[PDB]
Point group: C3
Chain length 189, copies 3
Amino acid sequence: PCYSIDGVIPVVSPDAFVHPTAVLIGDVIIEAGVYVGPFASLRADFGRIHINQNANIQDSCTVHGFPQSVTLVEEMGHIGHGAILHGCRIGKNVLVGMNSVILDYAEIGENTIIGANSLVKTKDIIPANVLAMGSPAKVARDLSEQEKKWKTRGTQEYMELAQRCLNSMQEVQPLSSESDDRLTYKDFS
Amino acid sequence: PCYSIDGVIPVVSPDAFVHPTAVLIGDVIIEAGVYVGPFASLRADFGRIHINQNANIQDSCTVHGFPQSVTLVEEMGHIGHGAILHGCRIGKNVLVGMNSVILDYAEIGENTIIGANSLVKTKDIIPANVLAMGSPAKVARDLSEQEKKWKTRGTQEYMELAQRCLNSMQEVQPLSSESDDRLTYKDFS
Amino acid sequence: HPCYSIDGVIPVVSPDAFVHPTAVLIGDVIIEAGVYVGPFASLRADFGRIHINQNANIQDSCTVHGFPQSVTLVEEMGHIGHGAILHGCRIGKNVLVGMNSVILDYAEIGENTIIGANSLVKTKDIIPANVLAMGSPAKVARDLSEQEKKWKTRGTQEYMELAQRCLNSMQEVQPLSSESDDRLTYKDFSS
Ligand SMILES: [Ca+2]
Ligand SMILES: [Zn+2]
Ligand SMILES: [Zn+2]
Ligand SMILES: [Zn+2]
């Protein structure tokens, strides 16, 4: 799923999992432990994209930016389904809710959670350790210690998912019907 | 387009159509008559995903869930382009408007229509036979009898589409220019 | 070229358009010269027609669709941002559709207009030309400055250049397993 452009080749840590239906274009760098899910477009054809270690990019997420831009997800950044990151900076251990849009030059402080379906305006700087949501997103409150531990729990699970996928994910013919003896989600490691 | 993980293999009814660019991961069960469109990610690597008969999952939709979660689309569920289903229950004959987010433990009552770009918060229960929209989504009014018929029409077209795609959809090289005698949408059923 | 026919209807793609190999074109899609179509864009003309005029771009995970007998139209230099969804609508010349926006059926966007990200344009809405509109449901906000109009034009020019660059050099490649000093970087893009 990696494409070069102008001779620029993505860099993918051997310990990261890129689903074969993701797309990596150009100056994309993936550090160890990262999970890239189906139909994630990490398109570095105008600028750079760096996904730091133990981060995850989920289904049909898009990472892009303007010419000479740098789009950064710091480690354990957690990018929910359908979120769009544009020339922005995602701080360490941040959660970007599903279907959210983070615009250019925006920065999200460490541990902060952006609610689903939110829009962070261009150049907005969101402090660390808060919940921000809405469109455009506004800080709602401090995160509790409960929520912070929960978030880590979710991110830790995606870290395991990358390993599970390197170990066992493969193309298969589907079964034509349910069977009494087939493995199920209860069989999940 | 099916992927196993931890040896768990998707189940796809022979009478469903899964576009070849969709992705089914893990404990996904697809019943008869269903349509799954391009870039739909049915990612059952943490829990179970069940798509009941005559439902449709449209382009770049994502279905995911919590560990040990069960995400259910009931019969004739109608999941619009770009909508994201996360550990929720979609009632029979529901319409989830495009680009909408349905969060964990949420349930949509039978026949209800969710407007585009909406967000159903975690654990929210949307009643049957209503229109709900917004972010966060709220009930706006009862569905009309005509609106209920129009939705059913819409879904019947997707049930037909599933059959059309099993019958005739295939990879082709594109034509290099429009022509006077090439088949067109006027030739559709 | 990832094209699919349905009911024997075959997409039409100019040789001078670039369609990323992971896009999907279904049915009666007509792509003209200079268009760029990005990863996982679904142009699904299985109920109606899709026409993408020249020098336009459809970005990542964009979806284009429409109801039976509909004609969905992106005019010249139409600029459809990441994850936007167009449903049986009319995208005027040189329009910009913000990321993650939804443009519903019979909607028309007048030429040069900018739709903000995360916007929803309601069915049959006619949004005028040369304005900035945004919200869900979207609403006209004000006229567009000449600064903004030239801002947009350069961006679209960038995507016309991307089509060429991509036809010229985009290729399936195995990734490097580590950064290195000699590898080309974004500093080596024309920009
Ligand atoms: Ca979206
Ligand atoms: Zn972009
Ligand atoms: Zn998820
Ligand atoms: Zn549609």
